[PDB]
Amino acid sequence: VDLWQDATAQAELVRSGEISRTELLEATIAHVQAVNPEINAVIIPLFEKARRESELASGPFAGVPYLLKDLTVVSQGDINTSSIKGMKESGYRADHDAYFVQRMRAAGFVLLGKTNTPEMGNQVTTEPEAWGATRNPWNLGRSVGGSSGGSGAAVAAALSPVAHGNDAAGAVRIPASVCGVVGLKPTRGRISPGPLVTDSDNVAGAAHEGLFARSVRDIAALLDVVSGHRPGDTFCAPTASRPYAQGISENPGSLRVGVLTHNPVGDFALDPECAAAARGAAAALAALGHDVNDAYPEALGDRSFLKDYSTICDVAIAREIERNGELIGRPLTEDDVEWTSWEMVKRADQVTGRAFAACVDELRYYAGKVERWWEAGWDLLILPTVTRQTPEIGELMLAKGTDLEGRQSAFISGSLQMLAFTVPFNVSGQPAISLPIGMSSDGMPIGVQIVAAYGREDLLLQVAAQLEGALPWVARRPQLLN
Ligand SMILES: O=C1CCCCCNC(=O)CCCCCN1
Numbered sequence: 001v002d003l004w005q006d007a008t009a010q011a012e013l014v015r016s017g018e019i020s021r022t023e024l025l026e027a028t029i030a031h032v033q034a035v036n037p038e039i040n041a042v043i044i045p046l047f048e049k050a051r052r053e054s055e056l057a058s059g060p061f062a063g064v065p066y067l068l069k070d071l072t073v074v075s076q077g078d079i080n081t082s083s084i085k086g087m088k089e090s091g092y093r094a095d096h097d098a099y100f101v102q103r104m105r106a107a108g109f110v111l112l113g114k115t116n117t118p119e120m121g122n123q124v125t126t127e128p129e130a131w132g133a134t135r136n137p138w139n140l141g142r143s144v145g146g147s148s149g150g151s152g153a154a155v156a157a158a159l160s161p162v163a164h165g166n167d168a169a170g171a172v173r174i175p176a177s178v179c180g181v182v183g184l185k186p187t188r189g190r191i192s193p194g195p196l197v198t199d200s201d202n203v204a205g206a207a208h209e210g211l212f213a214r215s216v217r218d219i220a221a222l223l224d225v226v227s228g229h230r231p232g233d234t235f236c237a238p239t240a241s242r243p244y245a246q247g248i249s250e251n252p253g254s255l256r257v258g259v260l261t262h263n264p265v266g267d268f269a270l271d272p273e274c275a276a277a278a279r280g281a282a283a284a285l286a287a288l289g290h291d292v293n294d295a296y297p298e299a300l301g302d303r304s305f306l307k308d309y310s311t312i313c314d315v316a317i318a319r320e321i322e323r324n325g326e327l328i329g330r331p332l333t334e335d336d337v338e339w340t341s342w343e344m345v346k347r348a349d350q351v352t353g354r355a356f357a358a359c360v361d362e363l364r365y366y367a368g369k370v371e372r373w374w375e376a377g378w379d380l381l382i383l384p385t386v387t388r389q390t391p392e393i394g395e396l397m398l399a400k401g402t403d404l405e406g407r408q409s410a411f412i413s414g415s416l417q418m419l420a421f422t423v424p425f426n427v428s429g430q431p432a433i434s435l436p437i438g439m440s441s442d443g444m445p446i447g448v449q450i451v452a453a454y455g456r457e458d459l460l461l462q463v464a465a466q467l468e469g470a471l472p473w474v475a476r477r478p479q480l481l482n
Contacts (some may be wrong), residue, residue: 004477006215007064007161007222011108014063021063025110028065032112032159039135041144041153043064044070044079044114052440059108060221065393066104067154067163070114071121073098074211081127082324086336089330095194096206098232100164100209107225112160113151120320120336123168124174124410126150133393137445137478138180143391145178145418147171147248148210152179155212156445157480162222163212166193168203169410170385170422171310172210173434177385177447180436180476182464184219187455188429189235191226195236196323197321198351200316205235205424206309206358214474219433220244223457235429238455252312252462254266255379257285258295260421265385267323268417274384274446277438280381281448284470295374296381300424305366309357309427310408311351315340317430320346327385334472338407339400347406363427370428374453378465385434385447388417421449423432429455433464436473443479 001024005013013019028046050065057063057130074080074094081088101111116126116134125171126149127133134149136142137157144153147381150163152175155163165172167185184395191209201206211222224243231237240247259282261275288294325332334342373381396415398404404412410419425432431452448467454458 003031003158005161007061007213007218008215010161011061011064011133021057023039024063025050025054025065028112028160034125035157035186036159036208037136038140038159038480040113040132040151041134041157042067042113042159043131043150046075046078046111046337049078050110050112050425053105055112055444057107057108062108064109065112065160066109067115068101068116069151069152069165071117071196072194072358073164073397074304074318075101075111078114082132083130084332084337085130085323085329086332087324088130092328096195099194100226101466103226103445106444115130115148115154115429117147119341121147121168122148122317122341122410123396124170125391125416126175127393127397135392135393136179137480141392142444143178143396145175145386148212149175151212152176152181152183152400155179155181156478158421161214162218165212166207167210167211168207169426170419172212173385173422173424173432173449176212176417176434176436178390178444178445180465180473180478182216182219182433182435183210184225184433185431186223186423187237187431188234190223190237190431190457192228192230192233194230194232197232198269198320200319203316204312204363205429206363208305208309208426213274216461216468217245217248220248220461240458243317244457244461247458248461248465250462252459254291254318255459256377257290257382258378259283259292260296260300260381260383261294263420265420266297268387271388273389273438273440274387276383277446278384279395280365281437281467281471284467285382288470290464295378296383297370299366299369299373302385303420304423305362305427306411307407307421308362309423311359312356313358313408314344314347317344318327319343330463340398350413365427370424371430371454379452379459381451383421383449385422385449386418387420389440390444400417425451428454430454431460435464437467437471455463
């Protein structure tokens with residue numbers, strides 16, 4: 001069984017009869033057992049559940065395995081740590097299935113296990129104290145990005161053809177860029193993170209559930225599976241007229257495309273190789289007939305909003321520490337979490353109701369400034385997913401002694417460059433996808449990001465499909481896989 005086939009092809013091999021559900025599953029489990037030890041991607045294997053669901057699985061993807069991030073969404077009866085030391089020791093297990101999980105099972109997917117993440121998803125690298133660092137299949141001494149680093153690495157190493165993750169500042173797109181896979185943060189309100197309400201209304205709407213895959217068609221199919229308004233969902237996205245798996249092949253025509261190949265904020269230089277990858281993709285779109293120009297939302301030249309976002313994040317983590325404490329029946333202390341997280345507890349205590357409300361308003365205002373660019377006639381923005389070369393393991397984790405006065409550790413220097421080009425779209429809520437189109441001169445994947453207007457995943461997946469055909473990446477594989 002060639003596990004390098006995408007989810008759609010793997011589903012067909014089972015439907016066709018070529019392969020059995022047990023063969024694919026067992027072939028996948030064996031692969032996981034052999035390769036995962038080297039990357040520490042899957043932290044909680046669920047082979048037994050995967051085996052039970054496989055026998056009962058039914059639908060367009062019956063028998064196809066997938067991985068779930070151990071954050072936000074939960075699976076009934078399974079361990080849930082959110083990479084919190086105090087929670088891992090408690091042996092806590094969730095009592096229900098998140099809507100996302102139910103939707104996947106009904107589609108025929110089998111829950112193979114959970115993937116690693118930094119504590120409560122508070123970093124753009126995946127090196128939690130609780131589970132250890134997740135390493136890059138392309139280079140074991142390198143980070144896999146974060147916070148959905150385990151899912152990104154898992155898919156890159158073929159531990160599964162698709163996986164789940166979430167994105168509040170680029171947590172799906174970043175790991176995708178760094179690990180050479182496709183990562184989509186859909187329009188705000190596209191995918192339900194319920195029935196639970198976590199992270200203070202999902203970080204005031206900035207946190208989106210996202211998807212990982214190696215093909216654009218797999219992403220389109222996944223959207224058809226997990227999208228839609230569910231009871232209690234705060235946000236909602238515009239409805240598509242046709243299923244995404246069908247519209248992906250439609251010709252969008254010549255679109256107004258703007259390309260960004262420098263850091264508009266001017267507080268650091270965009271890595272030349274990252275810029276060249278985006279430029280190359282822009283050239284391919286021009287060759288395809290689009291109206292490509294050097295242009296971008298002027299709002300991107302401002303990152304003042306990040307200060308306001310950080311304040312909201314302080315409150316969200318603080319209350320999340322509280323929520324997890326309740327799950328086990330006892331308050332969590334400075335000894336149950338990482339020092340970076342505990343520091344936010346104190347900061348949260350100094351945030352007033354009026355201040356919190358003002359910060360949220362600042363996000364809405366910024367979102368408006370950003371979206372006005374599309375309002376003015378532009379259809380898509382092309383830009384690098386990340387702005388720097390991939391960091392080495394350990395590089396982004398700051399020593400407890402370190403003094404990062406006032407702001408999120410992920411929003412400073414080395415970490416800032418990982419999320420500077422992704423976070424603006426968590427604020428605007430626009431659909432944004434990272435495609436594994438580039439490679440660094442030293443063999444590390446470089447993602448190219450495409451952003452469409454609010455709710456226009458249809459156009460986004462259409463152009464992504466064109467780029468997939470113009471600059472195919474399927475031929476490239478991490479050294480971990482020989
Ligand atoms: O999007 C991410 C990674 C960036 C972390 C930014 C700080 N915000 C939070 O920790 C809120 C929790 C969102 C987790 C998603 N991770």
